[PDB]
Enzyme design. Structure first.
Site, PDB file in Angstrom:
ATOM      1  N   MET B  39      55.079 -14.182   7.373  1.00 10.70           N
ATOM      2  CA  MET B  39      55.293 -15.605   7.161  1.00 10.70           C
ATOM      3  C   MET B  39      55.948 -16.184   8.413  1.00 10.70           C
ATOM      4  SD  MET B  39      55.868 -16.334   3.204  1.00 10.70           S
ATOM      5  CE  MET B  39      57.609 -16.030   3.119  1.00 10.70           C
ATOM      6  N   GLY B  40      55.638 -15.580   9.559  1.00 11.51           N
ATOM      7  CA  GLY B  40      56.184 -16.081  10.813  1.00 11.51           C
ATOM      8  C   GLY B  40      57.661 -15.803  11.007  1.00 11.51           C
ATOM      9  N   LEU B  42      58.975 -14.204  13.450  1.00 17.30           N
ATOM     10  CA  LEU B  42      58.950 -12.774  13.734  1.00 17.30           C
ATOM     11  C   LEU B  42      60.151 -12.202  14.459  1.00 17.30           C
ATOM     12  CD1 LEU B  42      55.240 -12.789  14.840  1.00 17.30           C
ATOM     13  CD2 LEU B  42      56.159 -12.422  12.520  1.00 17.30           C
ATOM     14  N   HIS B  43      60.541 -10.990  14.069  1.00 15.11           N
ATOM     15  CA  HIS B  43      61.638 -10.261  14.705  1.00 15.11           C
ATOM     16  C   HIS B  43      61.189  -8.804  14.878  1.00 15.11           C
ATOM     17  CE1 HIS B  43      62.476  -8.685  10.712  1.00 15.11           C
ATOM     18  NE2 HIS B  43      62.709  -9.906  10.261  1.00 15.11           N
ATOM     19  N   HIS B  46      59.097  -7.026  12.283  1.00 14.84           N
ATOM     20  CA  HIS B  46      57.665  -7.287  12.253  1.00 14.84           C
ATOM     21  C   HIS B  46      56.955  -6.566  13.382  1.00 14.84           C
ATOM     22  CE1 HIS B  46      59.570 -10.911  10.457  1.00 14.84           C
ATOM     23  NE2 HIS B  46      58.653 -10.708   9.526  1.00 14.84           N
ATOM     24  N   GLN B  71      54.891 -18.195  -3.298  1.00 15.11           N
ATOM     25  CA  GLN B  71      55.956 -17.211  -3.508  1.00 15.11           C
ATOM     26  C   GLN B  71      57.355 -17.784  -3.342  1.00 15.11           C
ATOM     27  OE1 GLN B  71      54.275 -14.797  -0.248  1.00 15.11           O
ATOM     28  NE2 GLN B  71      56.393 -14.275   0.282  1.00 15.11           N
ATOM     29  N   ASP B  84      56.604 -19.384  19.703  1.00 11.76           N
ATOM     30  CA  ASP B  84      57.357 -18.172  19.974  1.00 11.76           C
ATOM     31  C   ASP B  84      56.755 -16.968  19.241  1.00 11.76           C
ATOM     32  OD1 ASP B  84      59.530 -16.103  19.246  1.00 11.76           O
ATOM     33  OD2 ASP B  84      60.457 -17.226  20.883  1.00 11.76           O
ATOM     34  N   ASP B  85      56.281 -17.176  18.013  1.00 16.92           N
ATOM     35  CA  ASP B  85      55.672 -16.071  17.280  1.00 16.92           C
ATOM     36  C   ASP B  85      54.488 -15.543  18.051  1.00 16.92           C
ATOM     37  OD1 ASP B  85      57.441 -16.312  15.198  1.00 16.92           O
ATOM     38  OD2 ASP B  85      56.042 -17.386  13.882  1.00 16.92           O
ATOM     39  N   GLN B  88      55.280 -13.546  21.130  1.00 13.94           N
ATOM     40  CA  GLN B  88      55.658 -12.174  20.823  1.00 13.94           C
ATOM     41  C   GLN B  88      54.429 -11.326  20.543  1.00 13.94           C
ATOM     42  OE1 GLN B  88      59.408 -11.178  18.677  1.00 13.94           O
ATOM     43  NE2 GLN B  88      59.255 -13.276  17.904  1.00 13.94           N
ATOM     44  N   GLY B 154      56.533  -3.695   5.327  1.00 14.29           N
ATOM     45  CA  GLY B 154      57.783  -3.021   5.596  1.00 14.29           C
ATOM     46  C   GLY B 154      58.426  -2.480   4.334  1.00 14.29           C
ATOM     47  N   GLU B 155      59.125  -1.361   4.482  1.00  9.76           N
ATOM     48  CA  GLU B 155      59.826  -0.747   3.351  1.00  9.76           C
ATOM     49  C   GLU B 155      61.048  -1.565   2.980  1.00  9.76           C
ATOM     50  OE1 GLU B 155      60.793   3.281   4.178  1.00  9.76           O
ATOM     51  OE2 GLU B 155      58.759   3.947   3.775  1.00  9.76           O
ATOM     52  N   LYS B 156      61.474  -2.470   3.858  1.00  6.59           N
ATOM     53  CA  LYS B 156      62.635  -3.262   3.512  1.00  6.59           C
ATOM     54  C   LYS B 156      62.373  -4.011   2.208  1.00  6.59           C
ATOM     55  CE  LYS B 156      65.847  -6.663   4.735  1.00  6.59           C
ATOM     56  NZ  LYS B 156      65.537  -7.064   3.334  1.00  6.59           N
ATOM     57  N   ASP B 157      61.166  -4.552   2.038  1.00  5.57           N
ATOM     58  CA  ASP B 157      60.866  -5.227   0.764  1.00  5.57           C
ATOM     59  C   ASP B 157      60.125  -4.174  -0.065  1.00  5.57           C
ATOM     60  OD1 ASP B 157      61.808  -8.092   1.131  1.00  5.57           O
ATOM     61  OD2 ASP B 157      60.519  -7.852   2.887  1.00  5.57           O
ATOM     62  N   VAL B 183      63.574  -1.465  10.106  1.00  6.17           N
ATOM     63  CA  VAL B 183      64.175  -1.510  11.424  1.00  6.17           C
ATOM     64  C   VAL B 183      65.576  -2.055  11.155  1.00  6.17           C
ATOM     65  CG1 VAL B 183      64.123  -2.555  13.660  1.00  6.17           C
ATOM     66  CG2 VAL B 183      61.985  -1.914  12.542  1.00  6.17           C
ATOM     67  N   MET B 191      67.125  -5.414   9.446  1.00  9.87           N
ATOM     68  CA  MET B 191      66.764  -6.672  10.112  1.00  9.87           C
ATOM     69  C   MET B 191      66.141  -7.657   9.153  1.00  9.87           C
ATOM     70  SD  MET B 191      65.596  -5.847  13.976  1.00  9.87           S
ATOM     71  CE  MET B 191      66.753  -5.142  15.087  1.00  9.87           C
ATOM     72  N   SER B 192      66.529  -8.921   9.321  1.00  5.12           N
ATOM     73  CA  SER B 192      66.059  -9.996   8.482  1.00  5.12           C
ATOM     74  C   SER B 192      66.336 -11.343   9.149  1.00  5.12           C
ATOM     75  CB  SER B 192      66.794  -9.944   7.129  1.00  5.12           C
ATOM     76  OG  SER B 192      66.548 -11.107   6.367  1.00  5.12           O
ATOM     77  N   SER B 193      65.445 -12.313   8.925  1.00  7.22           N
ATOM     78  CA  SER B 193      65.638 -13.644   9.482  1.00  7.22           C
ATOM     79  C   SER B 193      66.857 -14.314   8.850  1.00  7.22           C
ATOM     80  CB  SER B 193      64.404 -14.514   9.227  1.00  7.22           C
ATOM     81  OG  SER B 193      64.101 -14.546   7.834  1.00  7.22           O
ATOM     82  N   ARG B 194      67.337 -13.765   7.742  1.00  2.00           N
ATOM     83  CA  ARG B 194      68.515 -14.340   7.073  1.00  2.00           C
ATOM     84  C   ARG B 194      69.841 -13.891   7.670  1.00  2.00           C
ATOM     85  NH1 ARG B 194      67.079 -13.961   0.587  1.00  2.00           N
ATOM     86  NH2 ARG B 194      65.100 -15.128   0.696  1.00  2.00           N
TER      87      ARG B 194
END
Lengths: 288, 284
Positions: B39-40, B42-43, B46, B71, B84-85, B88, B154-157, B183, B191-194
Site C-alpha cells: 500500500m505504498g 515503502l520501507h 518491503h 481494508q 519516492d516509492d 526505491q 511479510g511475516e510481520k502481518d 525486518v 519495521m513499520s510505517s507507524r
C-alpha cells in the site's frame, strides 16, 4: 501426470488431475471450455456442450458435482436427481473428452471456510426462499474456474439470475475467462427444460406450459408497454390450473439497481404441487 | 497490440488490463512473475519482499501500490509518497509497478467480495472485523489481474499471511505464497510505517514487544506457560504499553498443541499507535 486418451471420454475425480491435464492441454494450444453442471443431464445441458464444442480448437470439460453449499438445509440436497450412468453416456455421445467428477471431500476439505459473498442481487428473486444459495453457487464456480482455468465457461440463460451473478463474479474478481450465456432449450410446447420437470405428473406437465406461454405472450404485448406485458402474463398464469405463482417480475437486464428502460428481462417462478419451476424471457418495451 | 515493456527499467502501469496484458506476455517469454502487494510508503521491510522475489531465477517483479479502501475501518491519513516509492523500486531493479486508482479496482463499487473464515474475527479482527475481508478481496483481485507464479507477504502481518494461505487453498488458486521474515530495527522493533509516530518515551517502551517475544522463544524449552509468562513479564516492565492480546497458537493460528511448533503474537497500543509483532515458538 494422469493419462489422457484423445477423442475418448476421460473421467477425472481428483482436482489435481484435471488441473494438470487442463494445463497440459492449454500448453499444447488447445483452448479449454468448461460447462459446470450438477449432473442429471438433459437437452438443455447438451446445448451448452455443443456451444462449447464448436469453439475452434477446443477441448471440452464438463464438471458434474452436486454442490452441497448451494442447497438450503432440508431434504433438497438428498432429493436432487442423480443419474450418473446416463450423464456419462450422453457426454460420450457428444464427443466430450473430459468429465470432472469431484467428491465433496476434495472440494470442501476444510468445510465452509473462505467463501464468496455475492452482491445484493443474491438476496432477491431466488435468494428470497434461498438466502445462501448464490454464495454456494459462486463459491463452487470460482473454485471450478481456478481448477480448470478454462478460456470460456458456459451457462444457460434458463437460470438467468445465476448467469448474471456469475458475470458479476467474473468482473468483480477480474477473472480471465469469458462467460458465454446459451439460450434456453425448450420442449415442443415451450416448457423450459429442467431436471425438475421429471417431478411434474401428466396434469402438472400440461399446466406447466403456462409459464412459457405467459412469458411469450408478454414479450409480444410489450409493444404496448410494461403494464400490458405484465398483465398479459398474469392473465395466462391466472387461467392455469394448479399453478401457484411465487413471483413475476420485469427488471432491467442486469437485475441490478437500475430501472427498466426499454430492455428488460421478465422472470417467473411458480409451484406446481411441490415442484418449483422457473422461466424467463427477454422483453423489449415498445418494439414490434 | 500488447502495451510496451522496457526490460531493465521501471515500467509503471495504472490500468489493470495493461499490467494483465504485460504480465501474460512476459510469462510467455520465459519469465516467472513475482507479485509483491503493498500500500505504498515503502520501507526496508518491503524491500526484503522485493529482494526475495528478485532472487527467483527468471523473475520479473511486479510491486503493486494500492491503498485499498476496503481494508480500512468504517484512509486519507495513510502515508502516500508515490515518487519516492517508485524511486526505491527503481533502485532495487524492479521492472513493474502497478499503481491503480480505486475506481479502476472497484468499477462497480463493493459488490462481490471474499468472506474469510472465522479466523478473520479473532486477534486483529476484534478491533477491525471487516479488515481481512478487505485484504482477501483485494489480494484475490491482484492475483487474478497479475497471475503471478509466487506472491510475497511479510511475516510481520502473520494473521494476514495465514488468511492468505487459507484463501489460496480454499479457492484452489495456482500460486505459491511466500512468507518473508520480519525486518527489524537495530534494537529489535519490527519495521513499520507507524513507528515514526511514537514519541521518544513510546519508542523506547516499544522495544518491549520484540524483547518479550524473543524472551518467550528462549523460555520455551521450559514449556508454553513459561514462554507466555516470560513475555508477559517483559511487557509488564514497560510503561504506557496497553497490551490488546498476547496469544500462543499453532502455526496456522488454531489452538496451540501440547508441544511442537507454534506462533506467539502480541498487539499493543502506545498512545494512539497500535503495534504488532509475532515470533516462531518451539515448545520444549
Amino acid at each position: 501426470i494422469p493419462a489422457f486418451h484423445p477423442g475418448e471420454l476421460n473421467v477425472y475425480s481428483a482436482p489435481g488431475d484435471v488441473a494438470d491435464v487442463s494445463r497440459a492441454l492449454r500448453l499444447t494450444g488447445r483452448r479449454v471450455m468448461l460447462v459446470p453442471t450438477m449432473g442429471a443431464l438433459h437437452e438443455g445441458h447438451l446445448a451448452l456442450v455443443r456451444a462449447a464444442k464448436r469453439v475452434p480448437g477446443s477441448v471440452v470439460v464438463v464438471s458434474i458435482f452436486v454442490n452441497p453449499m448451494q442447497f438450503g438445509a432440508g431434504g433438497d440436497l438428498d432429493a436432487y436427481p442423480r443419474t450418473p450412468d446416463d450423464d456419462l453416456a450422453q457426454l460420450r455421445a457428444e464427443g466430450v473428452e473430459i468429465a470432472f467428477t469431484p467428491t465433496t471431500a476434495a472440494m470442501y476439505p476444510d468445510g465452509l471456510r473462505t467463501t464468496v459473498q455475492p452482491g445484493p442481487l443474491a438476496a432477491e428473486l431466488e435468494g428470497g426462499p434461498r438466502p445462501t444459495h448464490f454464495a454456494g453457487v459462486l463459491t463452487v464456480v470460482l473454485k471450478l474456474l481456478q481448477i480448470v482455468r478454462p478460456d470460456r465457461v458456459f451457462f444457460g440463460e434458463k437460470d438467468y439470475q445465476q448467469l448474471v451473478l456469475i458475470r458479476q463474479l467474473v468482473a468483480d474478481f477480474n477473472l480471465d475467462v469469458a462467460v458465454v450465456g446459451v439460450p434456453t432449450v425448450r420442449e415442443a410446447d415451450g416448457l423450459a427444460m429442467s431436471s425438475r420437470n421429471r417431478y411434474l405428473d401428466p396434469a402438472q406437465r400440461a399446466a406447466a406450459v403456462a409459464l412459457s406461454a405467459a412469458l411469450t405472450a408478454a414479450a409480444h404485448a410489450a409493444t404496448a408497454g410494461a403494464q400490458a406485458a405484465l398483465d398479459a402474463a398474469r392473465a395466462v398464469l391466472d387461467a392455469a390450473p394448479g399453478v401457484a405463482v411465487d413471483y413475476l417480475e420485469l427488471r432491467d437486464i442486469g437485475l441490478g439497481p437500475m430501472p427498466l428502460n426499454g430492455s428488460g428481462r421478465l422472470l417467473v417462478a411458480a409451484r406446481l404441487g411441490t415442484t418449483r419451476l422457473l422461466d424467463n424471457i427477454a422483453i423489449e418495451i415498445g418494439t414490434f
